């Protein structure tokens, strides 16, 4: 989903410096991934194999 957030900025020389802003922010769930396989690739004059 998406939830906005309030965050302090560090941009110097702008009308936003040292001010708070609300910006759109998306969230992704990324659980740990289980490793199963290993694949090898050789560089052939026609591409990868």
């Amino acid at each position: 989903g998406m939830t906005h957030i309030v965050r302090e900025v560090d941009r110097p020389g702008s009308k936003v410096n040292k001010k708070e802003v609300v910006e759109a922010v998306t969230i992704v769930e990324t659980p740990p991934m289980v490793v199963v396989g290993i694949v090898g690739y050789v560089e052939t004059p026609r591409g990868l194999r």
Partner: protein, 129 residues
């Protein structure tokens, strides 16, 4: 600098004239510093200079083109802090080419964008935002 605020005043808008020059309404005829698209009306926002004429007001100010700065709009524009705000009516002031006010004092509130872009308009300091 100035950010992309919601443009709510296209060419042909009849806004109020919030100053003591003697003009009641201003008729937006174009927008300064804009590049057009095929069949697209040049829109104006807050703090951006435009060319305008006086439809109703003093006969000496009527029937002539002069620069103007929009100070209040009814189209809700998003502030960078993360809030939306909009005024009661579309209103602007008249200025010269350099960016100096023609009238002495202003009336009604003035948006923060225009107040920070044009220092001479904020010099009157009627009401900010």
């Amino acid at each position: 600098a100035k950010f992309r605020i919601s443009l709510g005043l296209p060419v042909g808008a009849v806004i109020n004239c919030a100053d003591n020059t003697g003009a009641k309404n201003l008729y937006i005829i174009s927008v300064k510093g804009i590049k057009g698209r095929l069949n697209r009306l040049p829109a104006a926002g807050v703090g951006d200079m435009v060319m305008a004429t006086v439809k109703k007001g003093k006969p000496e100010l009527r029937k002539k083109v002069h620069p103007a700065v929009v100070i209040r709009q009814r189209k809700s524009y998003r502030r960078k802090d993360g809030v939306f705000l909009y005024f009661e009516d579309n209103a602007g002031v008249i200025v010269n080419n350099k960016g100096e006010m023609k009238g002495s004092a202003i009336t009604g509130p003035v948006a923060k964008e225009c107040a920070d872009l044009w220092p001479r308009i904020a010099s009157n300091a009627g009401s900010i935002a």
